[PDB]
Amino acid sequence: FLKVKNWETEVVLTDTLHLKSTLETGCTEYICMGSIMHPSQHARRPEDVATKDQLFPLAKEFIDQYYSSIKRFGSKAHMERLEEVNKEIDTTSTYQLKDTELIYGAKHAWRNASRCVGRIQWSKLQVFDARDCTTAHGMFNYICNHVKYATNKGNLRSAITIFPQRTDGKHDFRVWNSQLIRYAGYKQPDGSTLGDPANVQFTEICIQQGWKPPRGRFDVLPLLLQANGNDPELFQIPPELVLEVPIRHPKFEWFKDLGLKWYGLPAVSNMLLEIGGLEFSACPFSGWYMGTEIGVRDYCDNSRYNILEEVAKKMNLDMRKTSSLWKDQALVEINIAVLYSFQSDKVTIVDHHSATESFIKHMENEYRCRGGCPADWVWIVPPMSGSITPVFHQEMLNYRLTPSFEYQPDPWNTHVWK
Ligand X SMILES: C[C@H](O)[C@H](O)[C@H]1CNc2nc(N)[nH]c(=O)c2N1
Ligand Y SMILES: CNCc1cccc(-c2cc(C)cc(N)n2)c1
- Site for its own copies, rule CB under 8 A: 2, 4-5, 7-8, 18, 21-37, 291, 296-297, 300-303, 308, 322-325, 327-329, 331-332, 335-336, 339-340, 343, 351, 353-354, 377-378, 381-388, 392, 394-400
Adjacent-strand bridge partners of 224 = 234
CB of 97 to its own copies, least distance (A): 26
What residues have CB less than 8 Å from 198, skipping those under 6 apart? 185, 303, 304
Cα 379 to Cα 157: distance, rounded to the nearest angstrom: 23
At residue 341, what is the residue type?
S
Q: Measuring CA to CA, which residue among 20, 14, 3 is closest to residue 404?
A: 20
Q: Is 81 a catalytic residue?
A: no
The CB-of-391 to ligand X minimum distance in angstroms stands at 9
- Any contact of residue 395 with ligand X (CB under 6 A)? yes
Minimum distance from residue 218 beta carbon to ligand X (Å): 21
**Short-list 18, 88, 95, CA closest to 62:** 95
- For ligand X, give the closer residue by CB, 109 or 396: 396
Q: Which of 44, 111, 116, 248 is catalytic?
A: 116
Q: Which stretch binds ligand X (CB under 6 A): 14-22, 76-84, 314-322, 389-397?
A: 389-397
121 binds ligand HEM (CB under 6 A): yes
* DSSP bridge pairs for 200: none
* Of residues 292 and 394, the one with the C-beta less far from ligand Y: 292
Among 290, 330, 384, 397, indicate the residue that binds ligand Y (CB under 6 A). Answer: 290
The answer to whether 218 is a known ligand-binding residue is: no
Mark residues 242-281: x for contact with ligand Y by CB under 6 A, - for none: ------------------------x-x-------------
3-state secondary structure of 195: strand
Residues 400/25, Cβ–Cβ less than 8 Å: yes
Nearer to ligand X, 149 or 392 (CB): 392
Taking the least distance from each CB to ligand X, the nearer of 38 and 71 is 38
Question: Which secondary-structure segment (H or E) carries 285?
Answer: strand 285-286
Interacting residues with ligand X between 16 and 45 (CB under 6 A):
35, 37
Could you confirm whether 288 is annotated as catalytic?
Answer: yes
Look at residue 110 and give the partner it binds from ligand Y, ligand HEM, ligand X, none, a contact being a CB closer than 5 to 8 Å depending on partner kind: ligand HEM
Ligand-binding annotation for 110, yes or no, is: no
Query: How far apart, in whole angstroms, are the C-alpha atoms of residue 185 and residue 202?
Result: 8
Q: Based on C-alpha coordinates, what's the Rg of the chain?
A: 23
Q: Answer yes or no: are the C-beta atoms of 135 and 227 closer than 8 Å.
A: yes
> Contact between 394 and ligand X (CB under 6 A)?
yes
DSSP string, 313-370: HHHT---SSGGG-HHHHHHHHHHHHHHHHHHHTT--EE-HHHHHHHHHHHHHHHHHHT
Any binding-site annotation on 392? yes
Q: Which of 285, 326, 342, 367 binds ligand Y (CB under 6 A)?
A: 285
> Is 32 one of the binding residues for Zn ion (CB under 5 A)?
yes
- Known binding residue 85? Answer is no
Question: Which of 365, 370, 180, 406 has its CA nearest to residue 278?
Answer: 406
The catalytic position among 293, 357, 364, 406 is 293
Q: Running DSSP on this structure, what letter comes out for residue 246?
A: E
Cα→Cα distances 325→7, 186, 318, 329, 385, Å = 28, 31, 9, 6, 13
Instruction: Decide if 348 contacts 288 (C-beta within 8 A).
Output: yes
Is 301 among the residues that bind ligand Y (CB under 6 A)? no
Report the interface residues with ligand HEM, using CB under 6 A: 110, 113, 115-118, 121, 125, 158, 160, 285, 287-288, 290, 293, 350, 355, 379, 405
Q: Which residues are catalytic?
A: 116, 119, 288, 293
Report the interface residues with ligand X, using CB under 6 A: 7, 35, 37, 378-379, 392-395
